[PDB]
Amino acid sequence: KPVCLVVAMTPKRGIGINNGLPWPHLTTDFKHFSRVTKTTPASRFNAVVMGRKTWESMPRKFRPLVDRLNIVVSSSLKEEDIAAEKPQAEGQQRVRVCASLPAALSLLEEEYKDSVDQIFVVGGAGLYEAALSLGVASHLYITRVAREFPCDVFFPAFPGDDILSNKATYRPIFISKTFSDNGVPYDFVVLEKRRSSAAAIAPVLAWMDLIRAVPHVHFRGHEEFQYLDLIADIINNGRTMDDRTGVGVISKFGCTMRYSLDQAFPLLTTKRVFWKGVLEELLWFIRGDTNANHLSEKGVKIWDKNVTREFLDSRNLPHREVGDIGPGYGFQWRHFGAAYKDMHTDYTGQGVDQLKNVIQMLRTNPTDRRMLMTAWNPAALDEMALPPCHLLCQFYVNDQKELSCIMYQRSCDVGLGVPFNIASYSLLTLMVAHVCNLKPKEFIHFMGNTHVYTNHVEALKEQLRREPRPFPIVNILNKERIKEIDDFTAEDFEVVGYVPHGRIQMEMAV
Amino acid sequence: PVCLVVAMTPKRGIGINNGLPWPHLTTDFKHFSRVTKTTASRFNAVVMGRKTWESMPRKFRPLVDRLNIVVSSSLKEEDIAAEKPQAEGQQRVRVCASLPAALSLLEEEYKDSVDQIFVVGGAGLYEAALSLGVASHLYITRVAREFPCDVFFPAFPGDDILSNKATYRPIFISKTFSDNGVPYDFVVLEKRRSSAAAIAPVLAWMDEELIRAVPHVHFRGHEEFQYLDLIADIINNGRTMDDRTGVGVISKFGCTMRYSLDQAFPLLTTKRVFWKGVLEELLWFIRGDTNANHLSEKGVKIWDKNVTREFLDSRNLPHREVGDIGPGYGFQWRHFGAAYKDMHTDYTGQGVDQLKNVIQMLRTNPTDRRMLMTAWNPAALDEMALPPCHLLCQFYVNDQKELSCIMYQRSCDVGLGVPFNIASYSLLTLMVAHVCNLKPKEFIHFMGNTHVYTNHVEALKEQLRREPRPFPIVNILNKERIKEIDDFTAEDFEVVGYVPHGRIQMEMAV
Numbered sequence A: 001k002p003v004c005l006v007v008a009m010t011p012k013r014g015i016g017i018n019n020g021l022p023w024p025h026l027t028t029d030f031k032h033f034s035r036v037t038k039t040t041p042a043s044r045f046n047a048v049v050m051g052r053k054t055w056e057s058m059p060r061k062f063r064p065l066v067d068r069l070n071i072v073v074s075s076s077l078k079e080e081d082i083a084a085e086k087p088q089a090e091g092q093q094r095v096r097v098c099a100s101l102p103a104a105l106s107l108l109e110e111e112y113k114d115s116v117d118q119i120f121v122v123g124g125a126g127l128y129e130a131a132l133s134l135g136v137a138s139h140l141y142i143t144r145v146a147r148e149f150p151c152d153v154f155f156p157a158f159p160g161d162d163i164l165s166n167k168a169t170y171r172p173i174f175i176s177k178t179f180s181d182n183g184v185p186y187d188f189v190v191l192e193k194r195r196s197s198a199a200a201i202a203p204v205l206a207w208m209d210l211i212r213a214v215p216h217v218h219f220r221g222h223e224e225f226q227y228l229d230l231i232a233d234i235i236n237n238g239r240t241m242d243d244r245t246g247v248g249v250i251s252k253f254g255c256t257m258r259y260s261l262d263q264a265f266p267l268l269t270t271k272r273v274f275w276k277g278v279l280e281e282l283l284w285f286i287r288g289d290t291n292a293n294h295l296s297e298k299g300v301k302i303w304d305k306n307v308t309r310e311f312l313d314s315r316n317l318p319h320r321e322v323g324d325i326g327p328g329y330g331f332q333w334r335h336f337g338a339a340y341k342d343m344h345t346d347y348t349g350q351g352v353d354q355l356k357n358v359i360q361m362l363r364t365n366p367t368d369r370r371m372l373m374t375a376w377n378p379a380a381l382d383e384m385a386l387p388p389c390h391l392l393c394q395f396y397v398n399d400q401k402e403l404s405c406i407m408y409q410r411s412c413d414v415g416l417g418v419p420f421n422i423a424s425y426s427l428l429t430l431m432v433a434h435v436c437n438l439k440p441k442e443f444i445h446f447m448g449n450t451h452v453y454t455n456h457v458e459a460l461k462e463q464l465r466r467e468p469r470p471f472p473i474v475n476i477l478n479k480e481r482i483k484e485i486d487d488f489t490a491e492d493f494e495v496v497g498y499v500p501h502g503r504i505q506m507e508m509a510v
Numbered sequence B: 001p002v003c004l005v006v007a008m009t010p011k012r013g014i015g016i017n018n019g020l021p022w023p024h025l026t027t028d029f030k031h032f033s034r035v036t037k038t039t040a041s042r043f044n045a046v047v048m049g050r051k052t053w054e055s056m057p058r059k060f061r062p063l064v065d066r067l068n069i070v071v072s073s074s075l076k077e078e079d080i081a082a083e084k085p086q087a088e089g090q091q092r093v094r095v096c097a098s099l100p101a102a103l104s105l106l107e108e109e110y111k112d113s114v115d116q117i118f119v120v121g122g123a124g125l126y127e128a129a130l131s132l133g134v135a136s137h138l139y140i141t142r143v144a145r146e147f148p149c150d151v152f153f154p155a156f157p158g159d160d161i162l163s164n165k166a167t168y169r170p171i172f173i174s175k176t177f178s179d180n181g182v183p184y185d186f187v188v189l190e191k192r193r194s195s196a197a198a199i200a201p202v203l204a205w206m207d208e209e210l211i212r213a214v215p216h217v218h219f220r221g222h223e224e225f226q227y228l229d230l231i232a233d234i235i236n237n238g239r240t241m242d243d244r245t246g247v248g249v250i251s252k253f254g255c256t257m258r259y260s261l262d263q264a265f266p267l268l269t270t271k272r273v274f275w276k277g278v279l280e281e282l283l284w285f286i287r288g289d290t291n292a293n294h295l296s297e298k299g300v301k302i303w304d305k306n307v308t309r310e311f312l313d314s315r316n317l318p319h320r321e322v323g324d325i326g327p328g329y330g331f332q333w334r335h336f337g338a339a340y341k342d343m344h345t346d347y348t349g350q351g352v353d354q355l356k357n358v359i360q361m362l363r364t365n366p367t368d369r370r371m372l373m374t375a376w377n378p379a380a381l382d383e384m385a386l387p388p389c390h391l392l393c394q395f396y397v398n399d400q401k402e403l404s405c406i407m408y409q410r411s412c413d414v415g416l417g418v419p420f421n422i423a424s425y426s427l428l429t430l431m432v433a434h435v436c437n438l439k440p441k442e443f444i445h446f447m448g449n450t451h452v453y454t455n456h457v458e459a460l461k462e463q464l465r466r467e468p469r470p471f472p473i474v475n476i477l478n479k480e481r482i483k484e485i486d487d488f489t490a491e492d493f494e495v496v497g498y499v500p501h502g503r504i505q506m507e508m509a510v
């Protein structure tokens, strides 16, 4: 009696154009559709109910949908029209035609009470709209396509449609990890209409034996749940400490996350991440550049507060020009151990080029276990505006030419920095994979002092009420031009299908 | 349906002079109470021998909320009537002439009143119960230290759970506890001879999918299961690769373990770990010593194969004397960045003493987030006999003056090195805690390239068939004398209650 809806949908609720699908073929989505509509426990089949145009949109070879009772809602098509279109295969059910959705559901009760198990409404907008109006839909199986495409047909507005993009309810109980086919990111959600072996162990367990992110979500496949759960874990279980800043901190020690890079890109969705910032900083690092004015001048001000006259003096660096971070990250990457003078100097050929070494080892001997890059130079710390937070990274290639990367971070501002750090090293992994002819597989985040500032806790709690959106894809453009790590520009990247929730203001502790 | 509850030394010792052999173990008593009390209006019964009844302090006898039965021919029910004032709600103590009689009485006069029957000592009752074959389960507290005893729990098939020599197999192994300088743990042996319905179909298509360590053990509380499961995980899921050595490897990337240091010490038990080796190497590191002959001369040969004329030449270090590891681990700890000459040189005051800095920061500003030590100096790598494996560690103090330590290891020989590395940095944590007036809490192991050599897999599979024993305690002796990190000697340590399985020979891949 209670129907399910099954649908794939752009963020703007688009489902169709020109009586076809808006996107190229999404293989995994089709598998899912088939598997959800066919699978059943009994001589009980499922029924699929569809509109006339949806029936017409389907290629002849696939229609009628096999092993499923097909019902078409139409006032023009007759059952004989359909029977005449293609010969009924033995064992399959003869396609029914009904005048409306109510009629289709009556027919299912009247003529098929003992025959059908589940009822699926499978489009188009006519049927989705009616089903929601009648209030007979218990569950929505929604494939969220993260890219927008030209569409002329749309899934109707519904309470809970904030799962799709920014503006009885339908709340998500299931959010998968991000898939991709043909350069299209997407994921799967399910919404629900809302409004004496063990007996011997038991007594010993008994004596031996709160903030949660979107707790209604039971299957937490989306990899962003690692970040969301880490926020909750620190707030619930962390310890309140003082620190350098004078601001409060709640901290934990020794934390881990890992993000797939093969299908999509972990640009967190639960608040907008400053992508221009990640890209510009990483290119700056790669250059060995220590002049934060080069960032500031492009609208990336992340380093400004730590390179003021004031902050440099608090660090006993009176001789530093404003903007000079000293021998920080990129300097140690490209010139480890070289004698620093200032940000204006040519250091070409001084010290160890760790990045070159890593790349050359990846290209020639990828089973080597010493493919590390470090920014932590105890001899140079006092000369830096700030000791590095992300201080070491290690590369690994498997049997399939898949590249993984670990980064160790001594100090993790979970609220502000962590999302930015995830994106930064995930991007570096993409860039290195490309230049070494490898496939990016995984970014692995190892975290030391993992903390949330006290002045962030109330904003972070709001963030935890948001369900994640599918991750976008990052494409490297102009691959043919790009042969070395130094070749990348700010323009050779495309972020595809990024649909985050709004910015949340969070003040940087200087 | 009877269960035995007992605490026992590795040699099966239970008693001396009609008392317990050990000082009071608080957690064991909690456990005993909780197991025997926890349950309708149905109580548990405890059955005990006369001497056991006499051994118990009057304040605790009879055992509250439990039907007490004493097995004796000399003692009388009436004696207990007037021995002590009887509370309402509690059951009158019964006396029976034998264990068979106690069990008959339970059937005859307490058919439905009682749930579980517990035999609670002493050797008279344990022996009878095992002879009758009426015991289904053993609740055994394994005391890891040996004590003078005159009374022993009987030999039983499966008593190899206690020390090295119808069956009793362990189904439960807890983590290691300690009270009054006594390590112990808890085992249980068993006598042998539509929210989810909507999610279901989507989960089914998403999973399109075997070594296990002592699989009969269902509750896997012992922290050594992290190591055992990591072995299994690599063998099951790892990828076969070549490597530097020419030997096969099966590898994974990005692995984690963490070990409590507050109660006991993670010296793995499933094979004997070379403790003299860990202690001597760590002291050597702390000295800044780079002469492996100093280790070799004490019977610690771990560095010999990597400091031969042959190996040094394969590394293009002809000018190195045999035994000179170059500017490796301890050199970088105590003298980061100093110009190396040879192992005979005084480097006092050259480079950065990272260990001193960490300790001074712990003693003066323990909320600082830069308490790191690194051995990874890209400028010096080519001069080293071997690039360091354990390359970075970070310290952390919470609000309770508890010290935790993270160590990052780029390359992990799971078979040979890992157990040794766990012990090494856990020990360093103890030493640092003491000298900084802190309480050791936790060692956290972060692992990069995590591998098992192919020529170890056969031996590792044997290792996985062994149940872990309780972890020992490591005590620092002569605490009063020891005020700085340099003060420790090879003699200021005591390892208490270590009862590992036998050595397993595993060749070092050179």
Ligand SMILES: NC(=O)C1=CN([C@@H]2O[C@H](COP(=O)(O)OP(=O)(O)OC[C@H]3O[C@@H](n4cnc5c(N)ncnc54)[C@H](OP(=O)(O)O)[C@@H]3O)[C@@H](O)[C@H]2O)C=CC1
Pocket: A006, A007, A008, A009, A014, A015, A016, A017, A018, A019, A020, A021, A050, A051, A052, A053, A054, A055, A057, A073, A074, A075, A076, A077, A099, A100, A101, A122, A123, A124, A125, A126, A127, A130, A153
């Ligand atoms: N991305 C996705 O998940 C999905 C994509 N699609 C796309 O959607 C499009 C087709 O959907 P759409 O254009 O909305 O057409 P529909 O599938 O809704 O079919 C429209 C026709 O069906 C009949 N009908 C529908 N609703 C009613 C109603 N309430 N009462 C009576 N008759 C009704 C009428 O047939 P008649 O006029 O003969 O009486 C009507 O003209 C295509 O582009 C297709 O590719 C389809 C399914 C899902």
Ligand SMILES: NC(=O)C1=CN([C@@H]2O[C@H](COP(=O)(O)OP(=O)(O)OC[C@H]3O[C@@H](n4cnc5c(N)ncnc54)[C@H](OP(=O)(O)O)[C@@H]3O)[C@@H](O)[C@H]2O)C=CC1
Pocket: B005, B006, B007, B008, B013, B014, B015, B016, B017, B018, B019, B020, B048, B049, B050, B051, B052, B053, B055, B071, B072, B073, B074, B075, B097, B098, B099, B120, B121, B122, B123, B124, B125, B128, B151
């Ligand atoms: N570590 C642990 O977990 C525990 C250890 N203990 C220790 O054990 C010691 C006492 O144990 P133990 O010396 O064996 O004494 P018991 O407590 O077993 O009592 C022995 C007496 O019980 C009676 N009895 C024993 N066996 C039988 C039998 N098969 N049939 C009939 N009557 C029997 C006899 O008294 P009678 O002649 O009157 O019948 C015998 O002298 C103490 O040191 C105590 O601290 C005790 C509890 C648990």
Ligand SMILES: C#CCN(Cc1ccc2[nH]c(N)nc(=O)c2c1)c1ccc(C(=O)N[C@@H](CCC(=O)O)C(=O)O)cc1
Pocket: A271, A272, A273, A274, A277, A302, A303, A306, A413, A415, A416, A417, A418, A419, A420, A421, A508, A509, A510
């Ligand atoms: C990490 C790192 C590099 N850094 C450097 C940097 C320097 C000092 C720091 N200090 C503290 N206390 N926390 C930090 O995260 C931090 C980060 C950054 C600094 C600022 C922003 C920032 O202003 N954030 C963006 C939004 C980014 C996001 O969504 O997370 C903004 O517009 O505010 C980002 C990165």
Ligand SMILES: C#CCN(Cc1ccc2[nH]c(N)nc(=O)c2c1)c1ccc(C(=O)N[C@@H](CCC(=O)O)C(=O)O)cc1
Pocket: B271, B272, B273, B274, B277, B301, B302, B303, B306, B413, B415, B416, B417, B418, B419, B420, B421, B506, B507, B508, B509, B510
């Ligand atoms: C890590 C580390 C220290 N080290 C240093 C060290 C040096 C080179 C290495 N090389 C390789 N390939 N694997 C290693 O584990 C390794 C370890 C060790 C070296 C040897 C032994 C050894 O031959 N067996 C020990 C058993 C110790 C144990 O139980 O783990 C013995 O008793 O001889 C142990 C530790």
Ligand SMILES: Cc1ncc(-c2cccc(N3CCN(c4cnc(N)nc4N)CC3)c2)cn1
Pocket: A006, A007, A008, A021, A025, A029, A030, A033, A054, A058, A059, A062, A122, A123, A142, A143
């Ligand atoms: C190239 C191509 N074009 C179309 C199809 C195809 C085959 C069978 C059915 C369909 N439909 C397209 C829309 N459908 C659908 C697809 N995906 C979800 N999640 N829900 C749906 N209702 C079911 C109907 C499309 C397969 N391959």
Ligand SMILES: Cc1ncc(-c2cccc(N3CCN(c4cnc(N)nc4N)CC3)c2)cn1
Pocket: B005, B006, B007, B020, B024, B028, B029, B032, B056, B057, B060, B120, B121, B140, B141
């Ligand atoms: C100082 C002190 N001395 C003795 C006791 C005490 C109190 C009640 C009972 C006992 N027993 C000691 C040994 N017992 C026991 C203890 N622990 C386990 N695991 N099994 C057991 N059977 C039960 C008998 C000991 C408590 N406190």
Ligand SMILES: O=c1ccn([C@H]2C[C@H](O)[C@@H](COP(=O)(O)O)O2)c(=O)[nH]1
Pocket: A244, A387, A389, A390, A411, A412, A413, A414, A417, A418, A421, B368, B369, B370
């Ligand atoms: O890439 C970065 C740079 C900085 N920080 C944060 C961590 C701390 O909150 C702060 C630096 O303070 P200390 O860890 O140096 O005390 O900046 C990050 O999280 N990531």
Ligand SMILES: O=c1ccn([C@H]2C[C@H](O)[C@@H](COP(=O)(O)O)O2)c(=O)[nH]1
Pocket: A369, A370, B244, B386, B387, B389, B390, B411, B412, B413, B414, B416, B417, B418, B421
């Ligand atoms: O403390 C140590 C030192 C060495 N190794 C092992 C790891 C590797 O098997 C080998 C080092 O060889 P490379 O990682 O340099 O290839 O020694 C350890 O596990 N722990």
